[PDB]
C-alpha cells in the first residue's frame, strides 16, 4: 500500500505522452501504432525515446535514470491506453519497445553504475538458448492455512513466499504453487560479445549475457551483430550476483545517397574521383597487394570477390546469389595464407581461420550442451560470424567431413538448417568464402586433372565460382622479383608498400559501390551469352567440364565488375574481362 | 595526528600538494594538465619520486597507505581546482602510487606487512568477471510495500525483520536492481619465476580490483602490481561468528605496472668482448660446455637465444612476423638433446620446458576449467609468450596439438574458443623442439619425415633442422669419454647479460651488402634447387638467422658476414637434412 510519486508521475507523463504527443503531421502515432499492436502476435510497443525527450525532457532523463523501476508502470500505462482504445484481449501482456538512444556503449563500459538505468550497446551473438517460460508473479499458497499468497514476483529465481498472507499462520515453508494462476513470459538465453571494430588487439572480449522478451525473442540469431537496447541487472547465483542485461529492444548493427550525403565532401570527391578512375581495376589491386609479386590474376579474382554480384530472390521466392565462393591450391609456401592475411587485415567482416580447426562449432553453426545449465545451445562458428562478410578459411584441403557436408550445404543454400536433439534453427549466411588448399603431394601436377590435384568432392568444386592454380616456377627472374620484393620489405621497413589508393578510402568506395545494384544490359546479355558459347563451343582439356553453374559465375562476376565502376547497369567491357579472368583460370589437363 | 599514526591531515596535505608542485625529474603539474584535457581522473606517481623528495612522507605513506590515500586526492583535487579551476569532470582526480618498496621475494613476505604499500613483479594466472558487490541495499516490506534502504551494514546486509509502516513481521526484503552495487574484479597471481631463488614451490596470491582498475590486466600477463597487503578473518561456518585464528591474506591492487639495466660496467664488458673477433665462436664454445663436438647445433641455439630482430608490418598489412626463430633437434637417443634443452631451459630467462607427450606435467595448451568458475587456465606455450619453450619428445604428440603447433608457429598466437567466444592470447615464443628416431636407432635412406611420421608442412614452419647421430667411430667415442672423464673431476651469467641487453638495446636492420648477399643466396638456392627446391620460407629463415647474427655481433644493422654465416648454417641444416 506505498505508491512511489515518482513512478506515479513517470506514468502519468508517460500516458500523457501517449495520448497527446504525436508526428509532424499532428497524429498520435502512437495511437496508430497500438492500433496496430492490438493483432494476435502483438504486444511490444516501439517508443522513440527522443520524442518522450520533447514530450518532456524530465521524463525520459528520469526513465533513463530509473528505467527498470519505472518500466512496470509503464507497461500498466500501455495498458489503459491500449485497452479502452480498442477490443484488445482483456489480459495478454503488453510491453515498451525503446529506441533512439544516443548513448551506444560498449561492453567494457558497463558497470554497477549503469544497473537499472536504459543504455543502448552493440556487439555481436555467440550462442542462443532455447525459449524457456519464465514465472513473473508468482502465485502461491501456504499448506496450513491456505491463505493465497498471490503475486509473489520472482527475482529471476525460486523465491518461495516468505511468510503466509495468514497473519495467524506462520508455516513459511509449506507454499504450494499455483500453475495456472502466476504469471509466465518466455525468457531466451543468448551470449553477445564485443564486435572486433571495438575490441583492442589481442584482447578477450567480454562476454555477455543477455534476456530475450516478447517479440524479442526471435529478433536475433545466432552469430549475427545487433544492436540492443534496454539495461543491465545484476542476477544472484550460486550474496553471489552476475550481470546479464535484459534488452527491450533489438535492432540490426547499422542506400547510396544517404551514404553520400553523410559521407564527407573529401571522401565523396575522392570515391567520386575513384569511380571515374579509370584502371581502377590494376591500380587497387597493385596497392592492395604491395608485399606480392605476379599472381595479379589471383588479385584480380579477389578484388571481384570483395565486391561481389548483385543477389537476386525469385518470384518464386528462390534466393540467387550476390557473393561468390573462390578457391586457391598452391605449392608449399606461395603466400596463400599471405592473401588471405592481408584480404582479413583489410576488411572488416572478414575472418580467417582454418580447415584444421578443432572447434566444435566447426566454423559454423553447433548445438551443444551448456557447460554448465545442460541444455543444448546454438553456439554460432565464425562462418555465422561472417554473415553479409567473407571467410579466409585456411587449410580448406584439410577440412572435416561433418565440416566438408555443413559447408557443402551452406555454400548450396546460403543458409544452414541445424537440427539435433530435438531442437532445431535456421539461420541466413551470405557470406564470401576464400577457401586455400596445396595440392595432394604438396605439389601440383597440371598433367593431372584438379580432381586428382585436391581431395575435394565435386560439389565443393562445382559450388566454387573460381580456381586459382600457384605452381613453384623454376623461372629466375620470377625468383629473383619475388625475393626482391621481400628484401626491399625487410630493409625498406616500412614505405616498402606502393599504396596509389588508401586503405579507407579503398574501403570507403566499397562502402558506397556495395549500394549500388547494376543490372544488365540486353547488350551485355547476349554478350554473356555470345562468351558462353565460346565457353561452351571451347568445351575445355580442362580440368573440369562446363556446366550452367559457369554461367552463374559469369553473370555474377560481371555484376561484381559493374559494381567496380558504380555503374547502374553492366557493359561489355565488365563481360568480356570477366569471361577473360574465368576462361584463364580454366587450368587445361597438361598431359 | 589520527590515532597509532605519525599522520597529520593538513601537514601531510601540504607536504604532499608541495611534491606536487615542486619536484624535479614538475612533470606532475603538467600530467595534470594532459589529465584536464583528456579527462582521465587519475594520476599514477612512481612512489621512489616521493622517497627523493621526502623518505619520510614516503615512510608516512608505506605505512599508512589507506589513511594516507584520501588526503593525497584532497591535495590533487584542489590542484585541479587551482589550475584549471573551472572543468568537467564525471569525477575528480584520482592517485595510484607504485613502485615503491620492490620486496619481489613474494615467497618471503612477513605479517608485519599488513596494511602497508607493497610493489610486486608477477604473472596474472587466471581472473573472473567483475562481482557486482553490494554496497547500498534496497528494503521493502512485502505486507503493505514500505520501500526502505540500508547502507553500506559493514559487508554483511543487517535483514530489517520488521516494515516500518505497518511494523508486521519479517517482511522487508531486498530488492536486487534498487539496491547500489559495485563492481569488484578478483585475480590469482603468480610470483615471477624467475626472481625466486629455490623455486620449490612457487608462490601464489590473490587480488582485488575494487569498483575500477577492472579488466586492465589480461592473464598470463608479466605485470609489477602495488596495493594493500590486506588479511582478513575466514569464518568457522557461514552461520556461526566463529572465526579461525589464522587469517587468508590478499592484496587489494592500487596499480598495475604493465612489464636501465645492471650497472656500466657490464655494458663496459659486454661491449668489450664483442670486439673480440671470434666472440661469436667463443659463446657458442662456452656455451653449453659439457656437451662435446656439437658447435653448428650450439650456434644454431645461440642464434634463437639471440632471436630475429623484432619487426613490425603492421604498416604493410602483412600482419604479425614471426622474428622468433624455431629450431627442431632431431637425433637417436642418448645424443644429449634433453640435456642440450635443460641447459637451454635453465640459462635463458622466462623459458619453459615441457615434454610432447600429453603426459607432460604443465601441458601444452590451455582450456577452461572451474574452479567452480569455469576459468581459463594457460599453457606452456603461452606461459612462455615471449621466451622459450623447450619441447622434449616433440615427435610424440597429439595431431589436435600438432594442429596448435602449427597454428601458433604460423600466427604467434593461440586461438581457443573459450565457452562460445574465441581468444587470440599471442605467443610470439622460440620453440626449441627435441625428436627422436622412430625405433630405436635412426634407418639411414629414410628421410626425417620416414624416420619420424610427421607432417611435412609443420617441419617445413621449422626454419632449421639439426639431424645429429652416434656415428660408429671409436675415435669420437674415446675423445667424447676422455671429455667426460676429464668433466668428473666463461661463466653463464655474463652471457645470459649479453643476451639480455641485445635485446633491450640492440636492433639489427638490413644492409643493402646484406640484402643483394641473401637475393645471390636465394636463388643460387633456387637454382640448386631448379635441377627439394628453395622456398621463401628459407629466405624468411635466412634473413632471421642473419639478424640474430647481427644481433650477435651487436652491430644493429645487418651485414653481409651475418649472410655469409647464415647462409653456412643453413646449408649445414641441408647438408644434415640431406638424404637419397
Ligand atoms: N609470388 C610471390 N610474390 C611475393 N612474395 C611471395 C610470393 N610467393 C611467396 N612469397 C612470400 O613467401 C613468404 C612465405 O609464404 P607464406 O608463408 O605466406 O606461404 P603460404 O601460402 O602460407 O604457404 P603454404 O600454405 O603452401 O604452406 C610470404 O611472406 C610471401 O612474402
Ligand atoms: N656429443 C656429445 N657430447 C657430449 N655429451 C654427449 C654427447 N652425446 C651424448 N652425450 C652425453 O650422453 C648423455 C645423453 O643424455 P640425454 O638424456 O641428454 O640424451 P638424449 O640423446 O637427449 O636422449 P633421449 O632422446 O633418449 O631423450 C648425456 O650424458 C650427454 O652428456
Ligand atoms: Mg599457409
Ligand atoms: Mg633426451
Ligand atoms: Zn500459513
Ligand atoms: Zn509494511
Known sequence: EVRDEVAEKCQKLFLDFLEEFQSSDGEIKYLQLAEELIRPERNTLVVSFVDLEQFNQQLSTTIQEEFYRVYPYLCRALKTFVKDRKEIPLAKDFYVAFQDLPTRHKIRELTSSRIGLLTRISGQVVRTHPVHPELVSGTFLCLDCQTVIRDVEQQFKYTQPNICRNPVCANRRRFLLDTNKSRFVDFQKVRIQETQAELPRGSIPRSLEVILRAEAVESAQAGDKCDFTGTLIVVPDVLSYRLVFLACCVAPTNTAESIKNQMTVKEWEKVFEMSQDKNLYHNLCTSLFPTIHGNDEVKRGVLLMLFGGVPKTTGEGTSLRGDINVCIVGDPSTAKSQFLKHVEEFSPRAVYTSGKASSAAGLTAAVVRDEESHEFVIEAGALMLADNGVCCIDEFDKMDVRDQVAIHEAMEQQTISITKAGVKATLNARTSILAAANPISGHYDRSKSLKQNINLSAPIMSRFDLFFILVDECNEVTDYAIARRIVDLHSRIEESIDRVYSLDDIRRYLLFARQFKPKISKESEDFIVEQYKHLRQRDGKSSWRITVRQLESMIRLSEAMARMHCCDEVQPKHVKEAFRLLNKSIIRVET | ?580
Open chain 2, 1 to 580: 595526528v589520527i590515532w597509532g599514526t605519525d599522520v597529520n591531515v593538513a601537514a601531510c596535505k601540504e607536504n604532499f600538494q608541495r611534491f606536487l608542485q615542486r619536484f624535479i625529474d614538475p612533470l606532475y603539474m603538467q600530467r595534470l594538465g594532459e589529465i584536464n584535457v583528456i579527462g582521465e581522473p587519475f594520476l599514477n606517481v612512481n612512489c621512489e619520486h616521493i622517497k627523493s623528495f621526502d623518505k619520510n612522507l614516503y615512510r608516512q605513506l608505506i605505512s599508512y597507505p589507506q589513511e594516507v590515500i584520501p588526503t593525497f586526492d584532497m591535495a590533487v583535487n584542489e590542484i585541479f581546482f587551482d589550475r584549471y579551476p573551472d572543468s568537467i569532470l564525471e569525477h575528480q582526480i584520482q592517485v595510484r602510487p607504485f613502485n615503491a618498496l620492490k620486496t619481489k621475494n613474494m615467497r618471503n613476505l612477513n605479517p608485519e606487512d599488513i596494511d602497508q604499500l607493497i610493489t610486486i613483479s608477477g604473472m596474472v594466472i587466471r581472473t573472473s568477471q567483475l562481482i557486482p558487490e553490494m554496497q547500498e541495499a534496497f528494503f521493502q516490506c512485502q505486507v503493505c510495500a514500505h520501500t526502505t534502504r540500508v547502507e553500506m551494514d559493514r559487508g554483511r546486509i543487517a535483514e530489517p525483520s520488521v516494515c516500518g509502516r505497518c511494523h508486521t513481521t519479517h517482511s522487508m526484503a531486498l530488492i536486487h536492481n534498487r539496491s547500489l552495487f559495485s563492481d569488484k574484479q578478483m585475480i590469482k597471481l603468480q610470483e615471477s619465476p624467475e626472481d625466486m631463488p629455490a623455486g620449490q614451490t612457487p608462490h601464489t596470491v590473490i587480488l582485488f580490483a575494487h569498483n575500477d582498475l577492472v579488466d586492465k590486466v589480461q592473464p598470463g600477463d608479466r605485470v609489477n602490481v602495488t596495493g594493500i597487503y590486506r588479511a582478513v578473518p575466514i569464518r568457522v561456518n557461514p552461520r556461526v561468528s566463529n572465526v579461525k585464528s589464522v587469517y587468508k591474506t590478499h592484496i587489494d591492487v592500487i596499480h598495475y605496472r604493465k612489464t636501465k639495466l645492471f650497472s656500466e660496467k657490464r655494458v663496459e664488458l659486454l661491449k668489450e668482448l664483442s670486439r673480440k673477433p671470434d666472440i661469436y665462436e667463443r659463446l657458442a664454445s662456452a656455451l653449453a660446455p659439457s656437451i662435446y663436438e656439437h658447435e653448428d647445433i650450439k650456434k644454431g641455439i645461440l642464434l634463437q637465444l639471440f632471436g630475429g630482430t623484432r619487426k613490425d608490418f603492421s604498416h604493410t598489412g602483412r600482419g604479425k612476423f614471426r622474428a622468433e626463430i624455431n629450431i627442431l633437434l632431431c637425433g637417436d637417443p642418448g645424443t644429449s638433446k634433453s640435456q642440450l634443452l635443460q641447459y637451454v631451459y635453465n640459462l635463458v630467462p622466462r623459458g619453459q620446458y615441457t615434454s610432447g607427450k600429453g603426459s607432460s606435467a604443465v601441458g601444452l595448451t590451455a582450456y577452461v576449467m572451474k574452479d567452480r568458475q569455469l576459468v581459463l587456465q594457460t599453457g606452456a606455450l603461452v606461459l612462455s609468450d615471449n621466451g622459450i619453450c623447450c619441447i622434449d619428445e616433440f615427435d610424440k604428440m597429439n595431431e589436435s596439438t600438432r594442429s596448435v603447433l602449427h597454428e601458433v608457429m604460423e600466427q604467434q598466437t593461440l586461438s581457443i574458443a573459450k565457452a562460445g567466444i574465441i581468444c587470440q592470447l599471442n605467443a610470439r615464443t622460440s620453440v626449441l623442439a627435441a625428436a627422436n628416431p622412430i625405433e630405436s636407432q635412426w634407418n639411414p635412406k629414410k628421410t626425417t619425415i620416414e624416420n619420424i611420421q610427421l607432417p611435412h608442412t609443420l617441419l617445413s614452419r621449422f626454419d632449421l633442422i639439426f639431424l645429429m647421430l652416434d656415428p660408429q667411430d671409436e675415435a669420437y667415442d674415446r675423445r667424447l669419454a676422455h671429455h667426460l672423464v676429464a668433466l668428473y673431476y666463461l661463466d653463464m651469467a655474463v652471457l645470459k647479460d649479453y643476451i639480455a641487453y641485445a635485446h633491450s638495446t640492440i636492433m639489427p636492420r638490413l644492409s643493402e651488402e646484406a640484402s643483394q648477399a641473401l637475393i645471390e643466396a636465394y636463388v643460387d638456392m633456387r637454382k640448386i634447387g631448379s635441377s627439394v627446391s628453395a622456398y621463401p620460407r628459407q629466405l624468411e629463415s635466412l634473413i632471421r638467422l642473419a639478424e640474430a647474427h647481427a644481433k650477435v655481433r651487436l652491430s644493429n644493422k645487418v651485414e653481409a658476414i651475418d649472410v655469409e654465416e647464415a647462409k653456412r648454417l643453413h646449408r649445414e641444416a641441408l647438408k644434415q637434412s640431406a638424404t637419397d
